[PDB]
Amino acid sequence: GLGFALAKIDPELKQCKHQCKVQRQYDEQQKEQCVKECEKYYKEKKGREREHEHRD
């Protein structure tokens, strides 16, 4: 299919995913779980969402 597109998402995952990928190296499945938790915050709230944006 046409999965080449980056398909950017909300920035809140930028910082949370970064934290997951920088702290304690994780396998594809292990990193999937951390993203799942970060993504879960976004998913559950499903609102405008706000963050400090200390990093990036």
Method: NMR
Query: What is the Cα–Cα distance from 22 to 15, expressed in whole angstroms?
Result: 10
The distance of Cα 6 from the centroid of its chain, to the nearest Å, equals 14
What's the distance, Cα to Cα, between the start and end of the chain in Å? 31
Interacting residues of 38 by C-beta distance below 8 A, sequence separation 6+: 12, 13, 16, 17, 19, 20
Q: How far is CA 12 from CA 1, 3, 19, 25, 37, in A?
A: 28, 22, 11, 20, 12
The domain ranges of the chain are 12-43
Q: Which of 44, 51, 43, 45 is nearest to 15 (CA)?
A: 51
**C-alpha 31: how far from chain center:** 10
